[PDB]
Design a protein around this ligand. Structure first.
Ligand SMILES: NC(=O)c1ccc[n+]([C@@H]2O[C@H](COP(=O)([O-])OP(=O)(O)OC[C@H]3O[C@@H](n4cnc5c(N)ncnc54)[C@H](O)[C@@H]3O)[C@@H](O)[C@H]2O)c1
Ligand SMILES: O=P(O)(O)OC[C@H]1O[C@H](O)[C@H](O)[C@@H](O)[C@@H]1O
Ligand SMILES: [Mn+2]
Length: 432
């Protein structure tokens, strides 16, 4: 048996990493057809022409194509890999610049910039899934598209009976990968216990696979004396090294659990804002860094005619689904008791077994009071935001902005929200 796969967002900077991963895991994940879909034909073209060269060299049998036609992309598909960026990096720049220029953190998925990106994603994600369901109702939809917490909440309401949609994030695994470098072990030999929302969580235990010993006490010891580095620290930009290195401070103020690196924004908004350049942001770093290198690569290959971890995890998720492996991943799922003292309809992030029938979440119980206050505040802000999407309510958006920890003020919320409405004119829902 071989599988038909479609990548939504074929013009993404991560797509070449997917095409090379499909070649490497060719024996683990047998494919018969691959289609790159995108709404930007010119941005997707050099990536698709690079793939034709690559596939000819290393995957001749595979039938590869790139298109901007939904019918060609979504017909008779087994898996849909979604990695769109609603508004693209130019709008990510506006998310970061305007927030920082107005005295709050500007970030891709957290704060005012994340909720602005969330409103754009709600519109485009719901529109895209409806198209997909028009052609292949039973295809497994694996979504990377951000902001994941907001997208999952909106998709929960729009498709309540759809059981083949899974939102995932690679941050929990990247922390496990960083821990494996800390401990000089294979990251596949770590068994975590994790709870929280997307980009807002903590590891309560880090067990060794073979022996079951809690490695978390030793993890904090090496962090205090040596620090915390990403597993690919040699290739990472300086901003990522600072984000990972900041966990040393976080673990000294809050020593119980190993934190998701995104916790630093919510626990240290003053420090994080103080060290962010308002005129040269992370979106500019990506434009000058990853976007430039990847597109230049591809154009080098097209001109000549001849010729990782992020793309591999989604493929491994597809493998666990297609072959009913029931292996453990940290994915986003509906709560309904898994976190016992939070509401049923919250989209939370937990360890789950993954098979043909979807994620099988494991109960965590009642979380401590300190973390309950943090997560309920955030999940309420997210649910109020998609409330504004469904109700066309400016008032719901204002309450979502005010409640959020990275804004925290009603007058600042209205000031930022009004600025966001103007630049997001044709990409947001109406807010009246
Ligand atoms: N969940 C995670 O942990 C995780 C990790 C890494 C990246 N991501 C996400 O992957 C995405 C790719 O990021 P990037 O830096 O490559 O962005 P990018 O701008 O390079 O790629 C986005 C692509 O999606 C396309 N697109 C935009 N709107 C679309 C729509 N409505 N329909 C179809 N295609 C559309 C664009 O044409 C563009 O080619 C981002 O959304 C990012 O948040 C998620
Ligand atoms: O800032 P970038 O290099 O685009 O990467 C940002 C990405 O990194 C993190 O690991 C998160 O898992 C993603 O959700 C986020 O989008
Ligand atoms: Mn993520």
């Amino acid at each position: 048996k071989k599988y038909n796969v479609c990548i939504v967002g074929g013009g993404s900077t991560y797509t070449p990493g997917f095409l090379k991963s499909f070649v490497r895991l060719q024996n683990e994940f047998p494919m018969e057809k691959l289609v790159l879909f995108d709404i930007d034909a010119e941005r997707q073209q050099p990536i698709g022409e690079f793939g034709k060269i690559l596939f000819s060299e290393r995957f001749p049998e595979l039938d590869f194509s790139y298109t901007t036609d939904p019918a060609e992309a979504y017909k008779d598909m087994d898996f849909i890999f979604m990695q769109m960026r609603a508004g693209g990096l130019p709008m990510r720049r506006e998310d970061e610049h305007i927030s920082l220029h107005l005295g709050r953190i500007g970030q891709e998925t957290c704060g005012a910039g994340g909720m602005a990106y969330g409103l754009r994603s709600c519109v485009d994600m719901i529109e895209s899934i409806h198209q997909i369901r028009q052609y292949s109702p039973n295809a497994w939809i694996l979504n990377y598209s951000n902001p994941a917490a907001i997208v999952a909440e909106a998709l929960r309401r729009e498709f309540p009976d759809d059981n083949r949609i899974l939102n995932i994030c690679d941050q929990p695994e990247n922390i496990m990968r960083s821990v494996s470098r800390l401990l000089n072990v294979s990251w596949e030999d770590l068994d975590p216990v994790y709870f929280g929302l997307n980009h807002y969580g903590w590891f309560t235990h880090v067990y060794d696979r073979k022996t079951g010993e809690d490695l978390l006490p030793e993890i904090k010891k090496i962090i205090k004396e040596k620090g915390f580095l990403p597993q690919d620290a040699e290739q990472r930009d300086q901003s990522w090294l600072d984000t990972y290195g900041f966990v040393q401070t976080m673990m000294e103020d809050f020593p119980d659990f190993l934190p998701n690196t995104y916790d630093g924004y919510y626990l240290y908004p003053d420090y994080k804002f103080s060290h962010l350049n308002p005129d040269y942001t992370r979106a500019d770093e990506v434009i000058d860094g990853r976007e430039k290198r990847v597109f230049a690569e591809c154009r080098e290959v097209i001109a000549r005619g001849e010729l990782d971890a992020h793309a591999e995890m989604m493929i491994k998720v597809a493998e666990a689904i297609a072959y009913n492996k029931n292996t453990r991943f940290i994915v986003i799922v509906k709560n309904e008791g898994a976190i016992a003292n939070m509401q049923d309809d919250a989209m939370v992030e937990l360890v789950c077994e993954l098979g043909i029938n979807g994620p099988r979440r494991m109960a965590v119980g009642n979380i401590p009071q300190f973390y309950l206050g943090l997560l309920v505040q955030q999940v309420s802000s997210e649910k109020l935001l998609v409330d504004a999407y469904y109700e066309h309510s400016y008032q719901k958006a204002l309450e979502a902005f005010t409640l959020n920890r990275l804004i925290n003020d009603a007058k600042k919320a209205r000031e930022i929200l009004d600025a966001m409405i103007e630049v997001n004119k044709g990409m947001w829902p109406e807010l009246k």
